[PDB]
Design a protein around this ligand. Structure first.
Ligand SMILES: Cn1cc(-c2ccc([C@@H](NC(=O)C(C)(C)C)C(=O)NO)cc2)cn1
Ligand SMILES: Cn1cc(-c2ccc([C@@H](NC(=O)C(C)(C)C)C(=O)NO)cc2)cn1
Ligand SMILES: Cn1cc(-c2ccc([C@@H](NC(=O)C(C)(C)C)C(=O)NO)cc2)cn1
Ligand SMILES: [Zn+2]
Ligand SMILES: [Zn+2]
Ligand SMILES: [Zn+2]
Ligand SMILES: [Zn+2]
Ligand SMILES: [Zn+2]
Ligand SMILES: [Zn+2]
Lengths: 508, 514, 516
């Protein structure tokens, strides 16, 4: 629990913002019938033209003669609905009060994707960051179901928020105009919870590795557990040795921080009908070990992101603890360590023994993710759960298959894979099903060990999935590879990907 | 004097330093060429040219006091040789007293304006002969035009290239007399002992640089500095880790974390006996070894076997401390600063992505551990400005991009103050260590805007990393005139496989002519 | 003149747009003390706050409208800051009960804007112009600018506003409307009025160059490029001369001819001349590198980061000179004689290409050992510089996308200049100031010259790391007794942020020809 330091100036804690300015925002959802009021701050219409880059046209009645004049078709057709395009003008309303009115183009397609809506929100946020405002009002003149409306609110909150923990006025009111307002009102406070769970995971990932180490990260989990009345149990090296987790321990051999295993648990008040183990990869920094990330574009300055799996799990732990689902017992697991280069590091060629007895031949120390997951999975199955789900930044090959938008999911059970794909639909965190090709299993036949860590045959995501499959004997298990989608290179920040996906899974 | 840590007992605990050199035992005489040449003793060499005639024949003008040498130097004999720059011939013969003497020449081309590079090529041609000579005297006859500066440059270079470093070893013999015939001998006479001082400062810097990183570490180097300070009667102060932590030098301390050697901050000071009118802080990059950290120098041409040179900026500052402490300038106070450490790969190393806090409050996002020089300098520059000096001049092997811009002969100078830069450029002219002014382009500054930290250590996209590195350094000098010399391209002599000791004479000319 | 094709679908001419939308804009300048009239379109105030960083917006002009003045009272504007690049849109009704658009653009707290500062202001202005159908824009200058920065403002506003749609087919911007009127309110307006049409001239010269560069290598080839120079010269009534292979062979331009050996397009040497009616006091030769496509030759640009798909810009130097030719031919300076030169060819891989190791002979008789076929620019420039000196000129100014090393020395903003003459270099630097195309003086280091010594040829083509300096040393060997300057624009030519050419050099060359 005490964070070791090299010099006295080394941080001994991860700074965490719990109370965010978003939490202070009062949100009122009104129905568009009756007309819109424009009294103060910024009013933005979400408008499309079902044509391509067609003119803006406001449909909704506005209860203000000055703004109504500005919003008439003659003036608005000077602008167009190209997706992401925005304009906003400052003007005096009926009461001679200064108000800002504008729009965001929503393209020419009736139903926005999660990516389309994301670009819409970014255009909205840009205006929020450029204008000192007390209230934002958004008028929905487009078609949005409940799950996408919630996605809107979540994305709006996440992109509006600014991480200033390592640096050396927000709006206070949010108004939403939409048809069938009463049907959308329950999604607001759900969005605020999903928002923080994502932003919490974001804070952990964005936190540099000199801040976020196995000790400080485990301490953050305990702190979170105490705030949510979750049972918690942190496994130190002595215990892990007795549990014989030799794959996991080998990876952390080179670090100055001791291995720490995070085990958070949420139990429901009633009787439990489904037990779930969520496993997150928690590599606080991945230098690749003796297989150093030195190749061009290996992006070693990004590898603070390699505990994004753990972050998504902990962010999910927040959401579950806040929304309190019934009839479930959830175990939030993470084998947290650091992959470094030292005299104590494990070598390419080493043979290590996982807790289930399987000897593994290491071919590439930069493939450390599956090694720590191997022991976490064994530990997970020993809990006697119904579902084992792991989420991880496992393979760079994902950048070449699905890219930076869709995460991949692998598994041994079709029912479990389906529920995740369903969760992907409702959470709007896009995941695509990828196969485990058994014909590649033979490429993991070691000459000396029971199994190879890596292949000879490319397609590493499948091979890695084949490897992980060996450590789950008789339990429905799925594996989400988020190595490609975890980091937002355009915005230079994490996505907090996985939190809402995993929450929808536990809830729905 | 701190104890040097060891891994095995065979690890060295100090840098071997040669203080008394054979060069310090050569007696130098400067005669006027108008009176003829006395050629009865040792090797006599004529510096000649043939303006206009490219590779034209050799013709000796000087009357000599020997009938045997005179007949050898007659035009019929000498026109068998040409004056192509660097070309050399010398013959052994008997003088009128039947003594064994050696007579020859060195070609200086057909341009009546020998540059610094040409003069060095002439000197090297001379040194090659000296390295096979066993006579006790060398006489050089200047039948070419040189100014006082270029003449002192001739002596410095000669002294430096003549001397060979055998500290790590386990033919010829050094001359005891140097004769120089030249026009207005009386004026060039005062250049001799200035040259001998400039020589050793340069050679001292060369010894520190050339010494391998198992010999030259932060502990051994700071000890060597203390020893130099005591010999020059300079005030000195080595700042240790506990003090560095107190001063909150987080950027400096970060680089040194992965090393087995404790960080040591070298602070020497020269104060004039008279009233102080100028206050100068000289700052040198002092990375005893640069592996690159976790951004390990593994790429082709990363030249990691050279990386003992990464404290050349520090060596130049110390070599300057010798010259200044020896020549003792009036009315000036000089601070010699160098944040010394070692950039290694360990469990304790700082990582790519780490956000660290410099001593001035600014948080820095590390994008590349191999850009460690600007980090150590950042704290050195905050320290320097707290001293309240008028001028802060840093010199460093900072960016390898200098090899693609100015190359291996010219160093680059960046800065926030035009007058100070002009002062450097003037020091460049008189010291004959070439520097060229390069721009700090503020349009590139935005590339350092970090998403999380106060500022980025390096750029993501924008190349021309030298300009970017200056933009970074500029953030740690708040309202003092400051110049930055990047010697990453000129520090090492790849032809001779040795250091140049670049910067010692530049910095010294800077403080003397101030 | 006849452009060779492989298939009938291969283009035979560079599509060139002379009458651009910008040329249809009526530009009126008014003295700002005469009161601003706000009636139609969009009206933008260029505001700042000296000293107060992020200081409030204060409109200090006089507005001949009660309602707009009321809106622009300091009370209303306090909510907005003058942070450089920031803009806002206002909407109101004027005295004539007309709806009207008003706005501002922040210029920071500095009392005098740099070239980059003004370019930042202009870019914010164009954003307000994009995705908005306006019939008129009015710019009110509440910041101080000299004549040069004012002209630079207009130059930049025109260039960034204009969109190249020559190669758009099924994807033209259906909403791309251009303003028809431009109003400018400024102090001492009668001293700025002369700058307007000079800016319009300077605009097209830059955009003309931009069009040649942006045009791909199937459109812009040695023949189609040279034919475009002829067409320009005819419109400008300049003397023109296009040297073909037979002429080039008789002049023994082996270096230039070797470079084009592997191209399906014959070498074309562009020679344009402008002459003053009166006493010629200055003869100048402008030489631009004219490589329509740079594959690299057998030293193929195959390495990672070679940017072979960009190498259509390798005729940027040529375009800059032709852009300058337009400016000189239009502005018609006095007492000068200008020679616009460009040895145009294509560097390709073929059974006919020149090989690494080949020894070739320049038109001055010097033998050259080719060490790298991708260093083809200095080979063509060599013959071009000889042809230039034979014209008996006073100055030979050279411009070229010569070395990639510029990206590591000066980067993407500042071009480098080398030369054998202190005065000429200073004239270039002075022109860089007035034209606001940034240029830094870099040295020609004679110590490096020895590396160009060949065991067999008179001289080596390349050394065997300071490429830009070595390349200057090579070129210097082909100017015998004339003042010569060499501008390396390999790093500054392309605008990567906006994904388009800059048209760099045109204004700098023209200002050099004028201020002369
Ligand atoms: C966004 N991004 C992600 C990566 C990335 C690169 C490599 C890897 C993983 N490595 C791999 O997939 C290989 C098999 C070592 C190439 C890894 O280090 N797992 O612990 C995972 C992600 C690179 N960029
Ligand atoms: C003569 N030579 C100099 C170098 C050299 C190479 C790299 C660097 C510096 N590195 C850099 O400039 C980069 C930007 C990391 C490539 C450096 O290590 N700073 O601490 C400095 C010098 C290589 N050869
Ligand atoms: C913006 N950019 C410029 C380049 C560029 C790359 C290479 C070169 C030139 N080549 C060089 O400078 C070398 C010496 C071959 C590396 C060239 O091909 N000249 O004909 C010039 C420019 C690449 N990107
Ligand atoms: Zn890895
Ligand atoms: Zn990993
Ligand atoms: Zn380094
Ligand atoms: Zn270094
Ligand atoms: Zn080329
Ligand atoms: Zn080229």
């Amino acid at each position: 629990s005490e964070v070791p330091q090299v010099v006295s100036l080394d941080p001994t804690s991860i700074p965490i913002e719990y109370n965010t300015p978003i939490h202070d925002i009062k949100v009122q959802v009104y129905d568009i019938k009756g007309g819109c009021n424009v009294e103060e701050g910024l009013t933005i219409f979400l408008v499309n033209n079902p044509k391509e880059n067609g003119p803006v046209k406001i449909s909704s009645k506005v209860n203000d003669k000055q703004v109504s004049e500005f919003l008439k078709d003659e003036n608005m057709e000077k602008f167009n609905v190209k997706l992401g395009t925005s304009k906003h003008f400052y003007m005096f309303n009926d009461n001679k009060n200064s108000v800002a009115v504008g729009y965001v183009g929503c393209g020419s397609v009736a139903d926005l994707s999660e990516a389309d809506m994301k670009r819409v929100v970014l255009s909205l946020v840009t205006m929020l960051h450029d204008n000192k405002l007390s209230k934002l009002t958004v008028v929905f003149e487009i078609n949005v179901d409940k799950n996408l409306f919630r996605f809107f609110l979540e994305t709006l909150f996440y992109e509006y928020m600014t991480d200033e923990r390592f640096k050396s006025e927000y709006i206070k009111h949010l108004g939403v105009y939409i048809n069938n307002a009463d049907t959308y009102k329950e999604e607001v406070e759900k969005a605020r919870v999903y928002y923080f769970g994502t932003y919490y995971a974001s804070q952990l990932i964005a936190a540099p590795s000199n801040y976020c180490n196995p000790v400080s990260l485990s301490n953050a989990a305990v702190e979170l557990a105490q705030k949510l009345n979750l049972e918690y149990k942190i496994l130190g090296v002595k215990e892990l040795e007795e549990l014989k987790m030799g794959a996991y321990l080998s990876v952390g051999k080179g670090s100055m921080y001791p291995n720490k295993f995070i085990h958070l648990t949420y139990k429901s008040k009633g009787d439990v009908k489904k037990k779930i183990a969520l496993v997150g990869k928690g590599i606080t920094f991945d230098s690749g070990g003796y297989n150093l990330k030195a190749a061009p574009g290996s992006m070693i300055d990004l590898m603070k992101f390699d505990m994004s799996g753990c972050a998504a799990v902990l962010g999910c732990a927040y959401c579950v603890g806040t929304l309190k689902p019934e009839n479930v017992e959830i175990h939030f697991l993470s084998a947290v360590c650091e992959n470094m280069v030292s005299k104590n590091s494990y070598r390419p060629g080493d043979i290590i023994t996982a807790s289930n007895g399987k000897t593994i031949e290491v071919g590439n120390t930069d493939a450390e993710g599956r090694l720590t997951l191997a022991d976490a999975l064994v530990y997970a199955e020993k809990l006697g759960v119904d579902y084992i789900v792991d989420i991880a930044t496992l393979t760079g090959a994902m950048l070449y298959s699905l890219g930076t938008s869709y995460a991949g999911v692998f598994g041994n059970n079709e029912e479990l894979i389906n529920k995740i794909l369903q969760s992907s639909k409702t959470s709007n965190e896009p995941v695509w099903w990828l196969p485990i090709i058994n014909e590649y299993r033979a490429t993991l036949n070691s000459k000396y060990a029971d199994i190879n860590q890596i292949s000879s045959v490319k397609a590493s995501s499948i091979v890695a999935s084949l490897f992980l499959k060996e450590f789950v004997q008789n339990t429905a298990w799925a594996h989400i590879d988020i190595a490609g989608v975890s980091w937002n290179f355009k915005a230079r920040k994490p996505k907090g990907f996985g939190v809402r996906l995993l929450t929808e899974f536990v809830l729905n």
